[model samples]
Target: AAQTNAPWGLARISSTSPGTSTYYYDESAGQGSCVYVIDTGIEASHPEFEGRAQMVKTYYYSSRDGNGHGTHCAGTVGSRTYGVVKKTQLFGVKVLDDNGSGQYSTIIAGMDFVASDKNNRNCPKGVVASLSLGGGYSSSVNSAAARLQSSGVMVAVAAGNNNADARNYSPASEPSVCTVGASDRYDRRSSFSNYGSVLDIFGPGTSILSTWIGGSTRSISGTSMATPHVAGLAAYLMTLGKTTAASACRYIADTANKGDLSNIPFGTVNLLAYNNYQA
Candidate 1:
C-alpha cells in the first residue's frame, strides 16, 4: 500500500495516528493550494511531479536544480513518495546559486518577486513559500516576508542547523516567516536543530527521504528539510479555507502536538505537526 512508504510527515497531513499502521491517501488532497519553493531550484521533469512542478522564476541563477536542495524540499511539499499536499501546485523560484550559496539581496529579490507576482494575479491561489536556506539575520528579508504576509501569502523558513538559537538567523527570525525546526520520528528535537521562541514549530527533518535531482530519492537531515513539512501543512490549511497567512500559522500552532524537550532551553513545545483527516 502507498501508506507503507508514506513518511510520517504525510501521516500528519492525513491525520493518521502515529502509533497505528492504518492510513489513507488523497490524490486531490490540496487541489486549491499552491506551494512556491524558494531555494536552489527544482527538477521540473521529475516523474513523481506528474507534471505539476515548474521552475517559475529565478533570482540568483538560471532556473535549474544544480544542488538538488530545492527539488528535495519541493518533493516533501507535494510529490508522490514524500509530500504533505499530494496534489498541490508546485513552483520553484531559485534564489541560491549552484553551490548552495546566495547573496541577501538575491533572496530578498526572490521574496519580492513572489509577493508581486501573487498580488498581480500570477498565481491561482494565495501562494505559500517554502525557503530552506538561512544565514545571518537580515532586516531586508524580514521586511520582504512581512510584505508577503500582508498580501495574504504565507512564508515558511528553516531554523539554522547550527543548534543555536533561531533568533540569529535571517528568515527564521523574521516575524512574518513561520520558522520551523527539525524533529525525529520519535518526536524529539533533532540534535542539530536550532531552537528559540522564534521557532513556530518542528517537523520531520532527520533522515528525511525525498526526491533528488535526476529523478532519484535520498535521505538527508537539516532544519532545511523540516521547513517544507510545515510549508505543506500551511498550504493544506489554506485549501480548507484558511486563506490568510495569519490564520494558517495560527491554526498550525494551535493544533500541533506538544512535547517537553529534556535537553533544550524551551519547554512544553508544540513539537509535531497535526491534521484532522479521517478514514
Candidate 2:
C-alpha cells in the first residue's frame, strides 16, 4: 500500500520548488532546503536522479523491491527527475529488502544514521526526515525519535495501512512522532488505512501515482503514500518558519486545512494548510 501518485504533485511540484511542497518549506522561509530520506537506496544513477542527489549515508538492507514498493515511495518523496524535490539530496537506508520487509535492528540503524547527521548543517540543513513505512510501535524507538524531535529535526512516520486500531504500533503511536494516515480526494480516510486516537494527520493516498523502482510508473495505495504529503507540507511549513523544524510543525498543526480537520479523530495529525494560508 506504499505505492501511489500523491496530489500536490508531490514529485512534480518539488521539481521546480524543492522545499515548496514539503514540511521544510515552512522552516526555510521561502527558499529551497535539504532533506534526508531514510529508506532503501534510491536509483542514484537513474537518468532522473543524476546530479540531483548527494547521498550522505546509506545501509543497504537489500538492493531491490520485489514489488517495487520502496522505489515508489522514494519517487514520491525524493525522486530526482520525476519528483518535486529533484534537487534535494537523499540519505538512503535499505531497511526493506526486495521482499518489502526488514529486521527491527536494520530499521533502527537507519533512523540512527539520520539522527547522527543532525549536526551536518550544510547537508541536512535543518533536516526533515520522511518515513513511509510502519507496523508496530516500540517505546524505546519512540524515546530515540524524541531526541530527533527535540533537536528540531522533523520526523514524519506512516500510520500502518492495516485499517485496524493502530495504537499499538511503535513509532506511529508515539506521541512525539507525527503519525500520518491516508485520505482520498474527498478527504475521507482510506478503507485500508489504520485509524486510532493517535492518528496525527491525513494526506492524499488513495489512487495515487508515482515512479517505480526501475524508473517505471505505477499507482498504488497505503499510508506510506500519505506520509510524504505531510512531509512535503511539513517542508512547506519549515520554509515559512525560517528553517525551524519545530516551528514549522507547530504552524502546520495549528493551521491545518479546515476541511480536513473538521470533526477529525483525536490522534489525526494537525497538518498545516499550504495554499489556504494568506500572508
Candidate 3:
C-alpha cells in the first residue's frame, strides 16, 4: 500500500515506491494558488492533467516543440495530479524552444516577465517562481532570479544533475533561492545529484513517474524531476499558513527524516527533519 511506503511519513514516496503511487500535498490549502515554471512548454492534452495543469504563458525564444524537453519538465512539475504542486496554476515560460537550448538573454527575459506581470492579469502577488534551468554562476546573470526573492516570491531551482559541483551554476547556488538536490526515499543523494555548500534541501528526483507527450506516462530521473517537489511543498506550506519562504524552508528541513549518511558520504549534511519546518 502507499501508506506502507511512507510508514515514517518521512517521505511521500521513495525508490521502493511504485510508479503509480498517488501522493499529494495538502490540497485543501492550495486550491487557488499559482506557480510559474520557467522551462520549455507543457503537454496540455494528457489525461492526468484534468483540472490539474494549465499554461499561464508560453515563450519559444529559441525553437518550438522539437525536442519536447520542456513538456517533459512541465509534466514533472505538475502533470495533472501525477507530480507535485498539482493544485496550483501551471504557467510555462518556454525560453529554450524545442531543441532544449536557449541563450542566457532568453532566460533573463523570462525572469523579467515573472517580476513584472503588469496587469496582474497574467500574474498575481505571492506567486512562486519555479525554475528548472540555470547556467554559469554569474551575479549579473543571476540577478534576475535574485530579484524574485526580494519581491517575496519563492524561487526553487534544480541543483543540476551532473554530480560535479553545485557552485557551477548561478541562481541555483544563490542563498536566497531554495536549491533542491536529488535524493532517494532512503534519504541518500542520488549518484548523479550535485553537492555543494549552496544546496538548501533534497527532493525525490530519481525514476519519477509523470505525464508524457504522445499521450503516455514515463518514469524520469533527474534534478529536474525533484525541483517541483520542493515547489509543491512550498505551496502546501503556504496554504497551512506558513507564509514566509524562510519558515517553509525551516519546516521542510526540520521535518525531513535524516538517514544514515554512510550511503551518501559526500552529502554536506544528513537528511533534514521536515517536522520542524511546519507552520
Candidate 4:
C-alpha cells in the first residue's frame, strides 16, 4: 500500500500536482543502495533512522556531529519517517567541523573514500552521494566530483543558500554533478536558494522536517535540505537499475515535473524533481 498522511516533500514528489497528502512508490524503495551523506556526522541514534544510518567516515576532529546539519540531511535522505528510500544503506561522511565550517581538501577526500568504500556495504544496487554544503568557486572540488562520477557515483549537491548565481559556487557549478535548487510546497522557488544555469532542478526545501541532533525532529529551510530529496530519489532510481552516473542523471531530468515551479531565476532550470509515483 502507498503511504498516506506523508510529509509534504514526499507527497509532492510522488504526485503530478501539489496539494497531495499521500506518497506512492514501488515496494523496492532503495532496498540495497549505498547512499552517502557527506556533511557533518549524523546523529546515528535518531529513532527515525532505526539504526539504518551510520557514521562511517570522519575527516574533521571527531566522528560525532555536534551540529545538527548532517543529521538533518541524513533524515531527509533515508529516515523511515522522512525519507525517499527506506532500505538503502545510509552512511554519513563527516567533513565539516562543529562550527559548521569545512575545507574543500577534506571534502574531496571524503568523496574519494565513498567511491572506494564498497567495503562498507558493497552497494549491490549502486552509489549516490548527497552534499549539503558548498562554498566559493573551486576547481579542486569540481575535479573531485568529476572523479566521483568517473567512478560511477551519482552526486547531488546543494546550489547553496546564498541566493546568488550558483555559478559562483564549485560543485553546484560543476557540470559533473546534479546541482539542486529549492522549491516550496506551492511550487515556488525558495527565497534563499541559489540559481543559474548550473541548477539542475528544484526540490522541496521550505520548512523541511527531519531528525535533529538530539534525536528529535525539527523544521528548517535551505538548499541543503532540498538536496537530499534529489539524492534519495536518485538512489531510489539506482535500485531500479539506473546505476550509472549518466543514466540516473538523465532519468531524473527526463522524469522531473516540467513547468510546475514558479519564480525561477532567469537562468535557472524550471523543472522540479519527481519520483514518478502517485497516490
Alpha-carbon RMSD, each predicted model: 2.3, 5.9, 4.3, 1.4
- Report the lDDT tens digits of candidate 1 across residue range 1-279: 246646665654455245443336544467667888999999989998899899878875379899989999999998876877777889899989988998988888898888777654344445798989889987887788777777778888898999998888888888666888887766568899989888877777888889999999898888899899888878776776654666777678777776533344644255577765544
TM-score of each: 0.91, 0.78, 0.81, 0.96
Q: Lowest-scoring 10 consecutive residues by lDDT in candidate 1? A: 14-23
Candidate 3 regions exceeding 4 Å error are 1-25, 61-66, 118-125, 245-247, 259-262, 265-267, 272-279
| Candidate 3 worst ten-residue window by lDDT | 1-10
After superposition, the stretches of candidate 4 with alpha carbons farther than 4 Å from their true spots are none
Model 4, 1-279: lDDT tens digits are 477898899889888899998878777888788789998899898888888888888986789999999999988888888888877779999999987888889899998998888555778888889999899999989889888877888899999998899989987988878889999889999999999998888899998988899888889999999999999998888887754656777688888999998888676788888887633
Best model per lDDT = 4
For candidate 4, the 10 contiguous residues with the lowest summed lDDT are 241-250
Ranking by lDDT: 4, 1, 3, 2
Q: CA lDDT, every prediction?
A: 0.78, 0.59, 0.62, 0.87
Q: Whose lDDT is higher: candidate 1's or candidate 4's?
A: 4
Question: Ranking by TM-score, best first?
Answer: 4, 1, 3, 2
On the 0 to 100 scale, the lDDT of residue 197 in model 1 is 88
Model 3 vs. true fold: TM: 0.81
